[PDB]
Amino acid sequence: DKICLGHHAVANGTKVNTLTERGVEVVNATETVEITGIDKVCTKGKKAVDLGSCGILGTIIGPPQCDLHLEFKADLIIERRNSSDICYPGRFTNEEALRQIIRESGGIDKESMGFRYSGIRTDGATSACKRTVSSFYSEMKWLSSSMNNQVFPQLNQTYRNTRKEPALIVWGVHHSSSLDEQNKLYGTGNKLITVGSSKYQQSFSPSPGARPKVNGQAGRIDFHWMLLDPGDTVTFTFNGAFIAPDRATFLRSNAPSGIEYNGKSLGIQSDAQIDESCEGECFYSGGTINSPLPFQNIDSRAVGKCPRYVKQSSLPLALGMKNVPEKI
């Protein structure tokens, strides 16, 4: 005349490790490592821009590529692999540092620096920036002697940062294809460029020579940038070889909530298409990672709100009591 106390069991339960022992059979278990990712960028409910052919730094100075994205507003920014930051061969000083600024910008607003010129060619064009007809960077002016081989004027410019947000200022130094071309373009004799800000000063000189032909140009243009505090003057002084900013770049996450303001973007690097139907907060080169699980084995370098990255392909988590199969 009896009563028995029992617990459930199943015939074929999964094996889970514990600190004490390995591969203990149990009633139920769940995976904790996410190993497959959504190969799309999941942008639903987010404001996203695909630069595509556009290099990111190019958004600042305007090659023909970046024509769409000069004043873009974005929560999520996607760089792409074959993208070229430049139309006329050159490279940014502190380039990797400059992009990281832009990725988290929110996007960028542009306003004119107000520069005007008296006796110079400002309309400099190149085979490199074609755009219906040969052209230049959208956001800059190329300055030339206005008569070939005519010695270029010692000029000075001051621009002062009126706005509350620190401005982004970019300028160029041109290294001419030949010692001749510098002469033809900027006249002859010593060439000096100096840039002055309350925190910044430096002097640049062309070092003219042939360099391997990229985009059909032996010549190079090098871009140097600065951040200008409000109420600060950047002074531009140059006898030539100088590529001049026409517009200042302002971050959108420094705006005063005056409706330009679109705060705090995440810039990712992705090979995947876009998808406004699915949802994501974690991204990697493959696509989005969205998962109930708390770890991923997919990519070390994933960015956004992400599952922790772990070496292991599986750690299985117990969801039920230890399984003790029934006896005869």
Partner: protein, 169 residues
């Protein structure tokens, strides 16, 4: 065809609960899952896998560039630091899981005994332990008595004297 409890065995038969009662008496054999202790085990188990999130999730950005490589001297260090940190986080996740796992396995064993101890104490002197997790009852317990043992209303005085004669001679 005798019946035993948890000590040596699991019941593949019990399929509407985690823990349960198996009985036999003059009327026959019955099995009922117990709700409260099932829910108690289940509540502690759910929220696992949500607990592991919210302990191990972070917000981060690109330090190195895949598309154009940053300088190799520094590039080497960032790879070294990243791999070393992954070793640490891997160690940690495998340990945290093995903890939460030790814990589910153990607290389940815990809920079983919580319940059996309740029942032992509930039967006082009217029953004895076979030691398979079962109680031998020295009175006549019948399907409305069994439900009393279960529903936690078994009054041991009503049957004590019967049980004591039945137990001593």
């Amino acid at each position: 065809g005798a019946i035993a409890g948890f000590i040596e065995n699991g019941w593949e038969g019990l399929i509407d609960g985690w823990y349960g009662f198996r009985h036999q008496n003059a009327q026959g054999q019955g099995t009922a899952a117990d709700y409260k202790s099932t829910q108690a085990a289940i509540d502690q188990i759910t929220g696992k896998l949500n607990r592991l999130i919210e302990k191990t999730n972070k917000q981060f950005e690109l330090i190195d560039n895949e598309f154009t490589e940053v300088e190799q001297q520094i590039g080497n260090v960032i790879n070294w630091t990243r791999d070393s940190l992954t070793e640490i986080w891997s160690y940690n996740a495998e340990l945290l899981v093995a903890m939460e796992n030790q814990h589910t396995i153990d607290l389940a064993d815990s809920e079983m005994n919580k319940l059996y101890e309740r029942v032992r104490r509930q039967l006082r002197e009217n029953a004895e332990e076979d030691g398979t997790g079962c109680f031998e009852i020295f009175h006549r317990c019948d399907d409305q008595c069994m439900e009393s043992i279960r529903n936690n209303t078994y009054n041991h005085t009503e049957y004590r004297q019967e049980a004591l004669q039945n137990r001593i001679m």
